[PDB]
């Protein structure tokens, strides 16, 4: 619905300073674990 | 770990604002007077 009257004229500024913005983000994130185990046993039992 | 981060930003104050990602062709525009612009202020005065 229409709320007002239909104007003769508009009040009106001229303002034509254009602008471009750009904004990039990369984020990385690395993360490597190593473990290792060894055991030895060694028995030796002798007679004649 | 790793970041980076660009950020770019074009602005136009007269001339042909179209033309704000073409700089060749916005230099040969600068010349057209439907354009021309207030690009800066070296005097103000208080109304009262």
Request: glycine share 0%; no cysteine.
């Given at each position: 619905?229409?709320?007002?009257?239909?104007?003769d004229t508009l009040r009106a500024i001229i303002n034509n300073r254009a602008t471009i913005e750009t904004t990039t983000m990369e984020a990385e994130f690395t993360e490597?674990?190593?473990?290792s185990n060894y055991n030895s046993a060694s028995v030796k039992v002798s007679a004649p | 770990s790793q970041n980076r981060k660009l950020n770019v930003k074009y602005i136009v104050n007269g001339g042909d604002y179209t033309k704000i990602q073409n700089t060749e062709e916005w230099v040969?525009?600068?010349?057209?007077?439907e354009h021309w612009r207030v690009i800066e202020?070296?005097?103000?005065?208080?109304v009262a």
């Open positions: 619905r229409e709320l007002i009257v239909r104007p490597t674990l190593m473990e | 040969a525009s600068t010349n057209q007077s202020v070296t005097e103000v005065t208080a």
